[PDB]
Short mmCIF file of C-alpha atoms and ligand atoms in Angstrom, two decimals:
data_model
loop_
_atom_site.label_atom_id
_atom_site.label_comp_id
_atom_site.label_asym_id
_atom_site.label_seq_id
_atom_site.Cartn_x
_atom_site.Cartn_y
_atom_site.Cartn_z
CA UNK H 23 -17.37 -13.08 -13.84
CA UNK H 24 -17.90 -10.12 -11.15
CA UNK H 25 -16.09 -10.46 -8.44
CA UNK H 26 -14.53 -8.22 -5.31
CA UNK H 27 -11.90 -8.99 -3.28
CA UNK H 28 -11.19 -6.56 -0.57
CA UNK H 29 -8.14 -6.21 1.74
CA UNK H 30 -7.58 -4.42 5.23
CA UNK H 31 -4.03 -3.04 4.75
CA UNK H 32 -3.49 -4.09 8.82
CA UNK H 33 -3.97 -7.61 7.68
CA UNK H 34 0.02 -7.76 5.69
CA UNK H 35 1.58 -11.30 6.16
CA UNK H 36 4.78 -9.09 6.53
CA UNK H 37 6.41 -5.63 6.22
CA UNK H 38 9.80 -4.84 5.42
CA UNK H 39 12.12 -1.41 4.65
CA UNK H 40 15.23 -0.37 5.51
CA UNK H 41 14.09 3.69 6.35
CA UNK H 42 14.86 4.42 10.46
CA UNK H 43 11.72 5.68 11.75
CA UNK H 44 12.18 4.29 15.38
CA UNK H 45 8.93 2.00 15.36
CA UNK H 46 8.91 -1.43 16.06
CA UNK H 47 8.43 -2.56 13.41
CA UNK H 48 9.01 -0.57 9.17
CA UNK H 49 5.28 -0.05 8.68
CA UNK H 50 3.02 0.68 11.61
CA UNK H 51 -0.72 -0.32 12.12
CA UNK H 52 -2.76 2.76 13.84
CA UNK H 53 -6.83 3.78 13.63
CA UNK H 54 -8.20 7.29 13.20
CA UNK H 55 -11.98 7.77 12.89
CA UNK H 56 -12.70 3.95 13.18
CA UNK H 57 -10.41 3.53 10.20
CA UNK H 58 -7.88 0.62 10.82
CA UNK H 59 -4.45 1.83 8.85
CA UNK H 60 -0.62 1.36 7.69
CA UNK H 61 1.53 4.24 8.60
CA UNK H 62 4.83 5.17 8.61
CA UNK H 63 5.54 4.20 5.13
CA UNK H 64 8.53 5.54 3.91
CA UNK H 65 10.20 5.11 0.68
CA UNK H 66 11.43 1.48 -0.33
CA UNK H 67 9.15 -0.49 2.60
CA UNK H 68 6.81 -2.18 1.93
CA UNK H 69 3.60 -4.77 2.70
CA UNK H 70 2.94 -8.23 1.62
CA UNK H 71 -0.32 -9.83 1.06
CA UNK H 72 -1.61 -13.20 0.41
CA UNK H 73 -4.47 -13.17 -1.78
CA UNK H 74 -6.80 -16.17 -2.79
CA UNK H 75 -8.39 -15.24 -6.37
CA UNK H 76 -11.52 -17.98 -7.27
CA UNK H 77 -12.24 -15.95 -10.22
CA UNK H 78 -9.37 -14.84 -13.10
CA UNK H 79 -9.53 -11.90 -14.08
CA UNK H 80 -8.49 -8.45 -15.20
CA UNK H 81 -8.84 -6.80 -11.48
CA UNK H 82 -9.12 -3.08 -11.22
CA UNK H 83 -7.47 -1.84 -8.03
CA UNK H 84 -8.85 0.77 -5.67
CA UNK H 85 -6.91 2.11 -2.87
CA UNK H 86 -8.49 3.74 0.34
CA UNK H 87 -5.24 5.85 0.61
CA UNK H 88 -3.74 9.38 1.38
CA UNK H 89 -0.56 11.27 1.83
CA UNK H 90 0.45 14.49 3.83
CA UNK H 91 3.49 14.52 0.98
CA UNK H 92 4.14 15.18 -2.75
CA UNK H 93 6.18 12.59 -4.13
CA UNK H 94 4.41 9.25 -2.82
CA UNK H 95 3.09 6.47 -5.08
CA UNK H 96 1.99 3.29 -4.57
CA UNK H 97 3.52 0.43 -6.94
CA UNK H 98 1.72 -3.27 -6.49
CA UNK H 99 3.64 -6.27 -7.49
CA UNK H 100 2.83 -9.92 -7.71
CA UNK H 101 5.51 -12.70 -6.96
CA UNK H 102 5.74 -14.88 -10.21
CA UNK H 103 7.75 -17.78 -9.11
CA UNK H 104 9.93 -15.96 -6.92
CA UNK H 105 10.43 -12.61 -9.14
CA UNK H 106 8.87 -10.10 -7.94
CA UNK H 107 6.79 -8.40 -11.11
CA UNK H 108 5.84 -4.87 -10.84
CA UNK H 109 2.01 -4.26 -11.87
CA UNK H 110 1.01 -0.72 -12.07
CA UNK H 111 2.45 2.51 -9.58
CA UNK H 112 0.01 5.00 -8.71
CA UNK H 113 0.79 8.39 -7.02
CA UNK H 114 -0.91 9.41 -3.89
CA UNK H 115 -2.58 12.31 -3.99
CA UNK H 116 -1.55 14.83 -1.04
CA UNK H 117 -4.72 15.48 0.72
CA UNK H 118 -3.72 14.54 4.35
CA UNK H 119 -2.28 11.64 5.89
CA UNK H 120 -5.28 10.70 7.39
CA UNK H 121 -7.73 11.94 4.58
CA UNK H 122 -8.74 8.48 3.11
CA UNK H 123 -9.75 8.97 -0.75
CA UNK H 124 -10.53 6.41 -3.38
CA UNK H 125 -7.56 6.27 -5.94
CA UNK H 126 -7.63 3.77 -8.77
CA UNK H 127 -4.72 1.81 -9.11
CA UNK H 128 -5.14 0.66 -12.92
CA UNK H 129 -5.63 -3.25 -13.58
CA UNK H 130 -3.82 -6.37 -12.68
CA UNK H 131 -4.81 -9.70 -14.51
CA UNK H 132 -5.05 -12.56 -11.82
CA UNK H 133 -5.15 -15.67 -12.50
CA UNK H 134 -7.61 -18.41 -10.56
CA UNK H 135 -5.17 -19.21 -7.75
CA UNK H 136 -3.00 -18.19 -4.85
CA UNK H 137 -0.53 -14.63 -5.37
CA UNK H 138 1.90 -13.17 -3.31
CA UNK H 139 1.27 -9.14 -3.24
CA UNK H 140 3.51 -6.76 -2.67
CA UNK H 141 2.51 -3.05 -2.09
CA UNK H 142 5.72 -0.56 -2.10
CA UNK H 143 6.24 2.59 -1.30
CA UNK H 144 7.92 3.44 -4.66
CA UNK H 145 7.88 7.58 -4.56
CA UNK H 146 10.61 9.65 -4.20
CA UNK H 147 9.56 11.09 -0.67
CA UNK H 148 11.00 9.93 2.21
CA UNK H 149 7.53 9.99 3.05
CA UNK H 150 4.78 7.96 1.16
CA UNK H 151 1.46 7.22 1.92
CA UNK H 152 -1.19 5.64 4.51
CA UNK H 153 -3.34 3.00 3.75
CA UNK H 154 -6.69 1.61 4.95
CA UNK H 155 -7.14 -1.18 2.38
CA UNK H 156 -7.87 -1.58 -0.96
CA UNK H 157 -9.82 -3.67 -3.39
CA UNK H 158 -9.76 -6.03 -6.43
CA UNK H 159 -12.69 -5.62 -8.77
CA UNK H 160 -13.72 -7.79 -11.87
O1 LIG Z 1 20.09 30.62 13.81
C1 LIG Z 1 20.12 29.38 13.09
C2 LIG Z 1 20.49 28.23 14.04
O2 LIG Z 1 19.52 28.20 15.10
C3 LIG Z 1 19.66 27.04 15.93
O3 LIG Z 1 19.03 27.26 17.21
C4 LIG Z 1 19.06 25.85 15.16
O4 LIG Z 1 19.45 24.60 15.76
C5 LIG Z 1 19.41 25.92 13.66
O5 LIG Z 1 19.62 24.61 13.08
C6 LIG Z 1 18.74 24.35 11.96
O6 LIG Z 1 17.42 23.93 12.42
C7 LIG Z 1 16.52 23.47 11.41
C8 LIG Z 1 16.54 24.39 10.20
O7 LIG Z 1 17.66 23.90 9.40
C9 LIG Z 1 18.28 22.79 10.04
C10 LIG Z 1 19.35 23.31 11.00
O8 LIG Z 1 19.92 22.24 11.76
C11 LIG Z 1 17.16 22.21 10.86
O9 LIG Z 1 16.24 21.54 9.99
C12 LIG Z 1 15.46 20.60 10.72
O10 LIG Z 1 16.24 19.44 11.02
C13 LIG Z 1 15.59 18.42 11.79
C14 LIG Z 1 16.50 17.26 12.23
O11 LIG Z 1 17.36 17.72 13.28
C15 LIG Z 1 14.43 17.91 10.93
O12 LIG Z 1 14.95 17.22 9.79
C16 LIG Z 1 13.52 19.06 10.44
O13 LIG Z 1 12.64 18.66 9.38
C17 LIG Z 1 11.40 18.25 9.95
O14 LIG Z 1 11.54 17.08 10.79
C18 LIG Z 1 10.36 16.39 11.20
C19 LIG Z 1 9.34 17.41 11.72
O15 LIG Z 1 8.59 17.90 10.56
C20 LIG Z 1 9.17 17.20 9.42
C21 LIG Z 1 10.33 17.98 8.85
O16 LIG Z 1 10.90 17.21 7.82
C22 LIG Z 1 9.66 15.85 9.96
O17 LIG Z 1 8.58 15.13 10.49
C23 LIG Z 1 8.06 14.10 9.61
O18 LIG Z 1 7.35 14.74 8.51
C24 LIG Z 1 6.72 13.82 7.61
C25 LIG Z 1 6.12 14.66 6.48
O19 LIG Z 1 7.24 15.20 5.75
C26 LIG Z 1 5.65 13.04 8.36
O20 LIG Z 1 4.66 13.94 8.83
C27 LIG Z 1 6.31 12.27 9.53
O21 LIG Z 1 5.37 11.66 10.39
C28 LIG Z 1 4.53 10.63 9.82
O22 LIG Z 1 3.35 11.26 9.34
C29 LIG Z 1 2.27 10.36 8.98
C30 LIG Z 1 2.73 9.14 8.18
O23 LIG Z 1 3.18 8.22 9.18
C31 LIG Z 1 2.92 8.74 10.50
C32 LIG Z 1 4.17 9.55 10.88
O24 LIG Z 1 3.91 10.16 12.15
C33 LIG Z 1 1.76 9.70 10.26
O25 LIG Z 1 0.58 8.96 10.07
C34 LIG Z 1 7.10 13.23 10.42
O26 LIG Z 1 7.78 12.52 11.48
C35 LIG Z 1 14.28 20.22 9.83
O27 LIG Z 1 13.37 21.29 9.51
C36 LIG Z 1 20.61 26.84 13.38
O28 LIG Z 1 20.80 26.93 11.96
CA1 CA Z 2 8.73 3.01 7.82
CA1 CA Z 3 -8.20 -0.85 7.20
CL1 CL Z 4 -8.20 -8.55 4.91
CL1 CL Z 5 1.22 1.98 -13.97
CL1 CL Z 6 -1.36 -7.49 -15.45
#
């Protein structure tokens, strides 16, 4: 029943936030140290994902994440027939923007299938997080 599913954060079927940080588009894609990334996250945008899941499970979630901010966190969601349904939220350390660290993101039961997931920038900075991918472990 092992199983690892992991995702380049540069590879969202979509972004979206309302925040006016005078990029192109609400979350950027840049690279530091060979390290492809999502940047200027603020608070309330966000990254969708399309996942593929052979094996159901009880996933743990790792993020390769970091923050240059207090008050940053992570929430993933999963859309369950169009509701979006808010897994766990996990607070960025502050270690440096571009300081990747491991940071468990708690568990998220996945069913064999196809889900829609949404990671949002759920802190109260104006300022969240960058993110280089993370993973799904069973
Ligand atoms: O004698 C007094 C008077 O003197 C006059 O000459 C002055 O004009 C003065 O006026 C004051 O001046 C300052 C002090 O009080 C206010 C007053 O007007 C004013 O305060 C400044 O106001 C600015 C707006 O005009 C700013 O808000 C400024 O705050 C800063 O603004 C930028 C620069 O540093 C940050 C700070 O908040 C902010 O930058 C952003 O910081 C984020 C972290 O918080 C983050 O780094 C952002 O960048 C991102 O970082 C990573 C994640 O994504 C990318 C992205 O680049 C990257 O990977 C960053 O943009 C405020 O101090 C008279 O009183
Ligand atoms: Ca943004
Ligand atoms: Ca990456
Ligand atoms: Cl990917
Ligand atoms: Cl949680
Ligand atoms: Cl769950």
């Amino acid at each position: 029943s092992t199983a690892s599913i992991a995702v380049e954060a540069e590879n969202f079927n979509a972004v979206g936030g309302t925040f006016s940080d005078g990029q192109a588009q609400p979350v950027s894609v840049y690279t530091v140290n060979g390290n492809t990334a999502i940047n200027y996250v603020n608070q309330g945008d966000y990254a969708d994902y399309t996942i593929a899941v052979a094996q159901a499970g009880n996933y743990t979630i790792s993020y390769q994440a970091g923050s240059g901010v207090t008050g940053g966190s992570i929430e993933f969601l999963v859309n369950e027939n169009g509701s979006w349904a808010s897994k766990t939220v996990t607070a960025v350390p502050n270690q440096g923007w571009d300081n990747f660290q491991p940071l468990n993101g708690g568990s998220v039961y996945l069913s064999a299938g196809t889900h829609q997931v949404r990671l949002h920038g759920a802190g109260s900075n104006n300022w969240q997080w960058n993110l280089d991918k993370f993973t799904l472990s069973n």
